[PDB]
Amino acid sequence: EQYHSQVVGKIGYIARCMQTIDPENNLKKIREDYQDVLIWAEKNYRFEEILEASKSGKCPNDLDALSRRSLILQELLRLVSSISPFKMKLDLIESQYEKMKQHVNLWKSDYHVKLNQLNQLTDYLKNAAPTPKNNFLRAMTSVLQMQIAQYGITEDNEGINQLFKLGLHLLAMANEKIDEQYHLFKGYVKDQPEESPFEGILPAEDQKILVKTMIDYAMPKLSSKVLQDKLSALSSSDVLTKTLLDSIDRIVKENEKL
Amino acid sequence: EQYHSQVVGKIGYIARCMQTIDPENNLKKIREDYQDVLIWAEKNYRFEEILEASKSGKCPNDLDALSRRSLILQELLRLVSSISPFKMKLDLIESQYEKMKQHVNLWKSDYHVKLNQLNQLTDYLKNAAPTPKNNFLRAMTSVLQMQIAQYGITEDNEGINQLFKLGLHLLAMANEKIDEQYHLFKGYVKDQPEESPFEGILPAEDQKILVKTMIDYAMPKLSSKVLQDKLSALSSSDVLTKTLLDSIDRIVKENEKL
């Protein structure tokens, strides 16, 4: 979708740039650098097929890495195109490629990549339908935005870097993996320092939808009426907390013995 | 798009960024860094007044520098805009600005600036009207394209740096200062090693046009019809050579001796 379509676009664009840079297939060093990507554009796959390969992790699907590696070939294509009709010798092209490589890699790092990754999260949520994944993602992103407002992105912050890791992973995760989504979000809430991490950060209406979501997930998995009675009452809270989640986890433990 | 017109465009875009980042004029250090820009753009000047200031040097008119300085504020605006509705303390904003400034300054340097300047000349020459200025510029850019194909732009080459400097200077030169255009091109041809620096590079069709350009320039300056006929005798050459310009100069010297 919004993410894996850009992955396929970057894969097709890298191959287009490589072919125009090296129209006679002689820049073996550069093509070996990109063969992990180029193979998916040379194997007669359709757009839908590469899309499913990106969702299943069969092809390169790190959009930020693909974007950085596309910029390298784009820079080299600009040079090759701007000196037309004059050809450059093959080893000189590779010499230019190595310098552009380290130059672009430095630019595509530090605060800049974090800034791009935040945009990936907000753009993905721009018109996202209210799903558990999208509710988890919008809650995590709002915490991320609040922490960046307090700490910035030019220095390293472990809590922010964890939100980027888990958030982007949830973003690229398949929409049908309900268990993996619930596991990721419950993992983040437990593995973060604050007790009520969403207080003052999300509207009160959204905080209740989060509580109702976690309740409706474990509700059909109670192998006893008595265990499913108290869990239904835990919806009396309107803020997702670590105590509320541990309360749900304890009910699954008492039901696991039965 | 004319050079100085692009200068005004970036001057305006910098002011709109600053107004969105700091609407109440509290980031004193950032506005101090951009004071040479904002003193023109934060007032109600007409476009033509800023344009005349750029063409006369009264306001910053380095298009690559202005592009670099604009990217810093573009990145800083992205951060402030991407964390909304959460806001950042003013000290943190200026702290993020300093690190973004150093990061962008690394990106907007080295081969990348030269690539932008080469792309700037080739963009301008795309379907450009065959005027003396554009013919002079296309002749120098073609020599620049050839030398780059031979040496690249990732390593420093002094001959290439002079073609950029002279090429961009002629690119920004007013289309009406025709005697200044001729003098620049005449000076490049004389201050370069090759006797005929355009053969093997520029097409023979354009070399003949380049010769006829130098003849149509010095013909009105001829007062006596005897010298006017001596200049047309030089038109039998299809190669612009150092000797052809020395001959046209000697014919122009004896005309002033009357």
Author numbering:
A (entry chain B), B (entry chain A): 16 to 273
From the paper:
The protein SidK, secreted by Legionella pneumophila, interacts with the V-ATPase to inhibit acidification of the phagolysosome in the early stages of infection. This study reveals the structure of the V-ATPase:SidK complex, an assembly formed from the interaction of host and pathogen proteins involved in the infection of phagocytic white blood cells by Legionella pneumophila. These data show that binding of the N-terminal domain of SidK to the V-ATPase is responsible for its partial yet specific inhibition of V-ATPase activity.
One SidK construct, consisting of residues 16–278 (SidK-N), yielded two crystal forms that diffracted X-rays to 2.3 to 2.4 Å resolution and the structure of SidK-N was determined from these crystals. The second crystal form of SidK(16–278) contained two molecules in the asymmetric unit related by a non-crystallographic two-fold symmetry. In this crystal form SidK-N exists as a dimer, with the two molecules swapping their second and third α-helical bundles (red arrowheads and oval). This domain swapping is accomplished by a rotation of ~180° relative to the first α-helical bundle that occurs through conformational changes within the short linker connecting the first and second α-helical bundles (residues 117–125). The monomeric SidK predominates in solution, even at high concentrations, and therefore the elongated monomer structure is expected to be the functional state of the protein.
